Write a protein that binds this ligand. Structure first.
Ligand SMILES: C/C(=C\[C@H](C)CCCCC(=O)O)[C@@H]1O[C@@H]2C=C[C@@H]1OC(=O)\C=C/C=C\C=C\[C@H]1O[C@@H]3C[C@H]1O[C@@H](/C=C/C[C@H]1O[C@H](C[C@H](O)[C@H]1C)[C@@H](O)[C@@H](O)/C=C/CC/C=C/C2)[C@@H]3C
Lengths: 41, 883, 225, 82
């Protein structure tokens, strides 16, 4: 709900968690392809 | 604002900018100037600092002496332009009883870059720890250069120690003991190959600006830290698996002598903002409580960060945490960090357009970012113009001095993007110092113009703008609004070889006079000639050994009386799928002394340019991370058009699903229409309650007015709807948009209107470097690698696609055994297979049975080399071999 | 100016249903004249139909008609399908009155001089035991489809145009050098009063005549071949 | 009904699968026949063999694989699996 707009400090806190989702998503794709290969194997 | 020739861009800022944006190109200059120890640094540091500062090299000798002192630096050998032309390194030799020349010393341009072997490089500042966030040191360009010199000097003394013992005493001098090879080779080994030394990314002025200022985080660990406020931008980082590691410096970030980043802070005492702005490093930040930028200050005078936590000193302004690229996204406070990061990255992915239109709805950084990038011509001294020509501009300063500026005209950038400067001044114009004289590639009137302002409609249009696809009006092609020039460089060399010396000549062995029709007398394509895929650019010929020709060819030789020429053909043709006009030719000969690598006789390079119309398939995007390809381009006739008959330029589907939002995009679209049509609040008996927070200046505005809404301090929802209410009609006085920002559009095909009112407006979109012409690849047959006989992507083109392991799984899943076998054999590794297939295809015969893929044969050889006796046993044939 | 010779082909779907194709059209004339053709065929071809009817026994009774299985509503829907060509132009009042148990099939209605029913096998109603039914129905020529607007007089929706359902679609053909040439597909279902082919000629004739008003401003302009 | 097939989708796979065991057998079924037809248009089959077909009235420029599919749809040929 960014409709009202967030001040300086409010936006800083939001970045702390948003960056974890992008990094956590990087590990979701690697292992799934390493698992799918063993499955196929 | 505060700049002489600054254009009029009204701002919705409710807070004054107390401190002017620092020279955001200083991070590179200060460090290198401290390194070389320029007098400007000594004069600047002595005024408010230690009276005995030591230069980087001066400090290196201080610790090294006694084993060297007073090093010299002559004026630069050649000019930057002269270095980039001759492919040499912008350097100034340095000197140091016996005098010693240590080597050519690279130098930093005014743009904070280096010319290393004719290419413009940029050193990235590294942030290393001196644990906690504040414990980060941050090596500046000059400092991490000095450290590389330490290795050179120290190992140089290791050589002198060995030399003096074996050498006779008094029979040796500093010149005989000093072998500076490890010193000069240490700096040459840095600017090249070093991971911190990088080719300047410059397809738009902003890209190169953010390339500098960008820093490395490591010398969990990727997550942002409270300390990063006002220092490193958390909203800017690569999307790939390098997030967090790489980050761009904040706008107002300033580095202290050591390298510890400092942030501007205005100490707040007694609840009143003090104009005294002081440097507070990460550690010094906890000492005094820091106040929030957006604060309620009533008239004259008048949520804070704790020393170690969250929620004494006041912030200098908003966007301290934000970087330049991030600070240029209007309505940044509404978009999610993901899209904001996406938006910033795509801003530096834009390409310079031929027209370069400034954004209709922008922020504040445009003007400052453009002039600081270095791609815009600035007047050094107030005065008046004496001459204005497409080639150069001269200014007659009142002082009496006489300065001139040569303009980059169709200069190819590092990735083929054309950089063309336009003069914006006239003859008698009186210009002030620091003013803008000529526009850069992506600039207009001094401010960055990375895209164009287009009429948008946010309605789904018969599935052609599906998911992330976009549809454009053919007007964008006819009016060259999204047309961008792209220059390509080709090169060929003539050197000595094993059995002969290459000779670049016009005469080609087997060719018709038509194919050579566009070549000159020397054999190089004539200037201004149109070149299609496969045409010859430079005719080179190299010696061929014992001919041993085929008899079937010799017979035709005598029949048609064409003497089998002596040597082979080696001409430089245009890569497949490329085309354009020839701009310039650079010829470097040997008879003409010049200076080429040993064996090279002649060196010529041809530059080809292309005028790229915005084509279906190209990738467009806005400043809010929204991106998508061009799915279709309708003629202007069949396009949703307003009652004026004014067709819309692009039709964008509603990408933002709920929760996903992407709110910032919707805001600038409405403001885009406001700024395009002007407004007038029609104040009667006061002004509406929403305009109370507004400053007078935005009350009345004419059509096509540019607006500025700085990131966090920008227009607000209430003020918007109010501006929506005020909209100057067109010719005849009809109204095209209501207070909801919607309009009843007429389907240009059926002729009947669309049943519901559709949202229309003007959005600032960009043309991204991803281009169809560069990404379309097709291959029937082509070159094959040497070691592995697999289809190799020829340097011209024709690279084959990879059928990876996963694709094989999908092929096995279908059970298409034949299609799979076909791909891994006759289509790749089958030495005799792919030829007999092509043969069979031309004749129209059945395709033969696949053979043995060369990869497998190589496998057995690799095994045998490992002393593994492998035998491909038959059912009853015992052993077998390939052969 | 000269074009590329677009042709007009017709494929017969049924006895009263045929689809037409024009190939090739210049981008993007497919949609330009397309929607205008469907609009001309549907609401620009002259034809006679039923306007209002009155049935004996129903003046304030809304739902049912005694002695007949079909209700009031269902009875009207049948008569709407009645196709009759009347050149009288003005409202003519035909009469249909049959008694005794049986099936009234339009052929029972005596058409006044000037009107001719084209579907004599049409089922209008089924008759109950020892029951008679006298129906009077107004018929005046018209155009297109005019919705519905005296005691016991029931105005009914009027399907004036012979064309019953028309739809069109567009594709791309004619490779050569440019593969975005338009192909116009139009689907028209016609009542047996006039064939699909004639309907197109009437619609086409009325269009050219209608567009002759812009031509008369100057017959010397270039336009196209 | 299924309206009408356009190009590759004709004939339907369902009407073709009734002529063979599995979708895979259908592949080899039509594949080898296509090789037979194309041999016929050329000189077939070199020594000791004579090509047969097209059994059905070929289209204007119909591809031999597209012909073997129509032939299988009309039961014009029988096959034996090994
Ligand atoms: C991954 C990396 C550098 C990559 C080559 C580029 C960064 C990719 C991140 C991204 O663009 O999303 C790191 O670089 C340094 C040390 C370790 C790492 O090296 C690595 O892990 C790998 C390589 C490090 C240096 C390579 C130098 C040479 O390799 C080529 C030629 C030489 O320089 C390189 C040029 C890099 C310029 C890039 O600039 C970016 C865009 C493109 O990715 C490039 C044009 C611009 O967006 C610019 O603003 C961003 C610069 C990245 C700042 C990072 C500094 C730390 C080019 C690829």
């Amino acid at each position: 709900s960014f409709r009202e707009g967030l001040t300086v400090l409010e936006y800083f806190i939001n970045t702390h968690g948003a960056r974890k989702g992008l990094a956590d998503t990087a590990l979701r794709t690697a292992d799934s392809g390493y698992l799918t290969r063993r499955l196929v194997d | 604002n505060s700049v002489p020739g600054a254009p009029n861009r009204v701002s919705f800022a409710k807070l004054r900018e107390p401190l002017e944006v620092p020279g955001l190109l200083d991070v590179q200059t200060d460090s290198f100037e401290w390194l070389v120890g320029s007098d400007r640094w000594r004069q600047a540091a002595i005024d408010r600092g230690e009276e005995n500062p030591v230069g980087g090299l001066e400090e290196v000798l201080a610790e090294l002496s006694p084993i060297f002192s007073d090093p010299r630096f002559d004026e630069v050998k050649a000019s930057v332009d002269e270095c980039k032309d001759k492919d040499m390194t912008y350097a100034a030799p340095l000197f140091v009883s016996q005098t010693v020349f240590m080597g050519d010393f690279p130098m930093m341009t005014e743009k904070g870059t280096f010319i290393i072997n004719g290419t413009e490089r940029v050193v990235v500042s590294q942030l290393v720890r001196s644990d906690h966030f504040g414990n980060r040191r941050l090596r500046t360009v000059g400092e991490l250069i000095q450290n590389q010199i330490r290795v050179g000097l120290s190992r140089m003394e290791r050589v002198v120690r060995e030399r003096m013992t074996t050498q006779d005493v008094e029979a040796i001098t500093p010149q005989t003991l000093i072998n500076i090879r490890p010193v000069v080779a240490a700096i040459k080994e840095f600017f090249g190959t070093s991971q911190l030394s990088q080719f300047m990314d410059q397809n738009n002025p902003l890209s190169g600006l953010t390339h500098k200022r960008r820093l490395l985080a490591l010398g969990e660990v990727r997550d942002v830290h409270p300390s990063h406020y006002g220092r490193m931008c958390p909203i800017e980082t690569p999307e790939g698996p390098n997030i967090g590691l790489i980050g761009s410096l904040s706008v107002y970030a300033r580095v202290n002598p050591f390298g510890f980043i400092e942030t501007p802070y205005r100490k707040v005492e007694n609840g009143v903002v003090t104009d005294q702005i002081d440097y507070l490093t990460a550690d010094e930040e906890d000492r005094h409580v820091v106040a929030q930028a957006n604060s309620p200050t009533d008239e004259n005078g008048r949520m804070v960060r704790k020393k170690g936590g969250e929620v004494d000193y006041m912030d200098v302004s908003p966007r301290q945490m934000v970087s330049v690229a991030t600070a240029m996204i209007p309505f940044l406070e509404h978009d999610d960090a993901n899209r904001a990061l996406m938006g910033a990255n795509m801003q530096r992915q834009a390409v310079p357009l031929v027209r370069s239109e400034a954004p209709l709805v922008g922020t504040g950084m445009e003007l400052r970012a453009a002039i600081d990038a270095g791609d815009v011509v600035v007047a050094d001294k107030t005065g008046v113009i004496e001459e204005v020509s497409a080639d150069y501009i001269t200014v007659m300063a009142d002082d009496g001095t006489r300065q001139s500026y040569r303009l980059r005209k169709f200069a190819r950038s590092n990735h083929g993007t054309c950089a063309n400067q336009r003069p914006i001044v006239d003859a008698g114009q009186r210009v002030e110092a620091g003013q803008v004289i000529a526009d850069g590639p992506c600039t207009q009137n001094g401010e960055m113009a990375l895209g164009k302002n287009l009429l948008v409609a946010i309605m789904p249009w018969e599935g052609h703008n599906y998911e992330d696809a976009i549809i454009l009006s053919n007007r964008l092609v006819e009016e060259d609004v999204l047309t961008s020039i792209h220059i390509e460089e080709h090169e060929i060399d003539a050197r000595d070889t094993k059995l002969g010396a290459e000779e670049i000549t016009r005469d080609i062995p087997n060719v018709s006079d038509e194919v050579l029709a566009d070549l000159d007398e020397r054999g190089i394509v004539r200037i201004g000639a149109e070149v299609r895929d496969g045409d010859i650019l430079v005719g080179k010929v190299t010696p061929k050994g014992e001919t041993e020709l085929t008899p079937e060819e010799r017979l035709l030789r005598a029949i048609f009386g064409e003497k089998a020429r002596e040597v082979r053909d080696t001409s430089l043709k245009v890569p497949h799928g490329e085309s354009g006009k020839v701009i310039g030719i650079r010829v470097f000969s040997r008879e003409d002394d010049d200076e080429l690598p040993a064996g090279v006789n002649e060196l010529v390079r041809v530059y080809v340019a292309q005028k790229r119309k915005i084509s279906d398939g190209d990738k467009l995007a806005g400043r809010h991370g929204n991106k998508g390809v061009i799915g279709k381009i309708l003629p202007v006739e069949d396009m949703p058009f307003l009652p004026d008959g004014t067709p819309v330029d692009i039709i964008l589907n509603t990408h933002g699903v709920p929760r996903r939002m992407n709110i910032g995009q919707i805001l600038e679209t409405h403001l885009g229409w406001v700024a395009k049509a002007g407004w007038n609040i029609d104040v009667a008996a006061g002004v509406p309650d929403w305009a109370s927070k507004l400053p007078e200046e935005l009350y009345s505005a004419p059509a096509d007015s540019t607006v500025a809404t700085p990131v966090f301090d920008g227009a607000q929802e209430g003020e918007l709807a109010g501006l929506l209410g005020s909209t100057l009609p067109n010719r005849d006085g009809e109204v095209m948009v209501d207070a909801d920002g919607k309009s009843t559009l007429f389907d240009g095909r059926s002729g009947e209107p669309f049943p519901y009112p559709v949202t229309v407006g003007y959005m600032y979109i960009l043309k991204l470097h991803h281009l169809v012409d560069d990404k379309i690849h097709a291959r029937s047959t082509g070159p094959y690698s040497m070691i592995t006989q697999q289809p190799l992507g020829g340097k011209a083109q024709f690279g084959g696609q990879r059928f990876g392991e996963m694709e094989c799984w999908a092929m096995q899943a279908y059970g298409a055994a034949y299609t799979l076998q076909e791909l891994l054999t006759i289509k790749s590794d089958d030495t005799v297979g792919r030829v007999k297939v092509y043969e069979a295809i031309v004749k129209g015969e059945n395709i033969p049975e696949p053979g043995i893929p060369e990869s497998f044969k190589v496998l057995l050889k690799e095994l045998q080399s490992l002393c593994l006796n492998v035998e491909v046993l038959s059912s009853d044939g015992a052993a077998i071999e390939m052969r | 100016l000269i074009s590329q010779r677009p042709t007009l082909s017709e494929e017969t779907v049924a006895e009263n249903r045929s689809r037409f194709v024009i190939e090739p059209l210049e981008p993007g004339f497919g949609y330009t004249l397309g929607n205008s053709l469907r609009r001309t065929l549907l609401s620009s071809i002259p034809g006679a139909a039923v306007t209002s009817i009155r049935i004996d026994g129903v003046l304030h009774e809304f739902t049912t008609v005694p002695g007949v299985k079909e209700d009031v509503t269902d009875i009207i829907l049948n008569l709407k399908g009645l196709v009759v060509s009347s050149d009288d132009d003005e409202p003519v009042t035909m009469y249909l009155r049959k008694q005794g148990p049986g099936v009234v099939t339009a052929g029972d209605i005596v058409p006044p001089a000037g009107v001719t029913v084209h579907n004599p096998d049409m089922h209008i109603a089924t008759l109950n035991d020892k029951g008679k039914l006298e129906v009077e129905l107004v018929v005046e020529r018209g155009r297109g489809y005019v919705p519905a607007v005296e005691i016991g007089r029931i105005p009914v929706d009027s399907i004036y145009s012979p064309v019953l359902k028309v739809t069109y679609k567009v594709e791309a053909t004619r490779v050569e050098q440019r593969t975005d040439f338009d192909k116009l597909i139009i689907d028209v279902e016609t009542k047996n009063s006039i064939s699909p082919r004639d309907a197109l000629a009437s619609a086409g004739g009325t269009l050219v005549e209608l567009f002759g008003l812009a031509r008369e401003l100057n017959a010397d302009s270039e336009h196209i071949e | 009904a299924y309206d009408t097939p356009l190009g590759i989708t004709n004939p339907p796979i369902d009407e073709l699968l009734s002529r063979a065991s599995s979708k895979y057998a259908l592949v080899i079924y039509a594949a080898k026949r296509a090789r037979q037809i194309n041999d016929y248009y050329n000189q077939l089959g070199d020594g000791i063999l004579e090509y047969v077909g097209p059994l059905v009235e070929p289209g204007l420029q119909e591809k031999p694989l597209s012909i073997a599919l129509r032939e299988i749809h009309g039961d014009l040929l029988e096959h034996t699996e090994g």
